[PDB]
Symmetry: C2
Subunit: 158 residues, 2 copies
């Protein structure tokens, strides 16, 4: 004979505390993407461009053509341009919505030819109560071989 | 000859973003140079560094009164300090002085043994029309010798 639920109740869902049931693989899984990179260096500044490759086949360009990934080196790191991305979300009230975000990738080179850095997501609007929140996601890039013959990369300077 | 008279309402527009300094062979404004006594503590999980600020006239001495110890943490290929919430005076698009809420930090990327990076100032309020503006200032740090004997640095893991 449980005590009856009668009346107004506030229900509080503590999302910041959510956990996954143990599993020996990252949850959510990492996002792995393959890129054909090319670099153009003036004696003033360096730019790199990247064409996205297919996940089922790293020998082929991804179709339809993904916009070329532009990165610029400066102040010790590679950094892409902030992309203004809309983002679905759920507000503190349960109501689904969408919030405005800036996303970029920063990548810092290491001796052996690998890079380490992060993706940075910034929320600019407050539809879901997160205006001003900054999410950082660790990132690793490693060169796994040379350009695939079937794939062009445009000149970064153009 | 005699000029056309100024009579009536006039809008005056001052294009600050286009301000320039009269030529001078030194950076304007001048670089800010500051000296720091650093010490590092690395666990196999994460590394921290702390720094005591040294005196502007005499690099052998701690700056007084004691500046808060400069905390930096290494992660994802760089040294980064914690965002300091700093109020900043400013003038709005209307001329009225005011002050805006800013977040400031320093990021420093190590090089084969110097460091290079930037200070990042973010504006969080809109009293001067700059909410969301991000200012980046290039930064260079170089080790110019050892710890001065007259100067302690706290353990980074303290606090």
């Amino acid at each position: 004979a449980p005590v009856p639920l009668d009346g107004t109740y506030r229900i509080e869902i503590q999302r910041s505390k959510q956990t996954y049931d143990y599993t020996p693989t990252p949850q959510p899984p990492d996002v792995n993407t393959w890129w054909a990179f090319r670099t153009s260096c003036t004696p003033t500044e360096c730019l790199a461009a990247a064409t996205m490759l297919d996940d089922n086949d790293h020998t082929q360009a991804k179709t339809p053509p993904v916009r070329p990934f532009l990165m610029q080196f400066g102040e010790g790191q590679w950094k892409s341009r902030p992309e203004t991305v809309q983002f679905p979300c759920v507000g503190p009230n349960g109501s689904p919505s969408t919030q405005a975000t800036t996303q970029l990738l920063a990548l810092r080179p290491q001796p052996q030819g690998d890079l380490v850095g992060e993706m940075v997501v910034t929320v600019h609007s407050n539809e879901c109560g997160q205006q001003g929140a900054v999410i950082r996601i660790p990132a690793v890039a490693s060169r796994s071989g040379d350009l695939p013959p079937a794939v062009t990369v445009p000149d970064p300077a153009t």
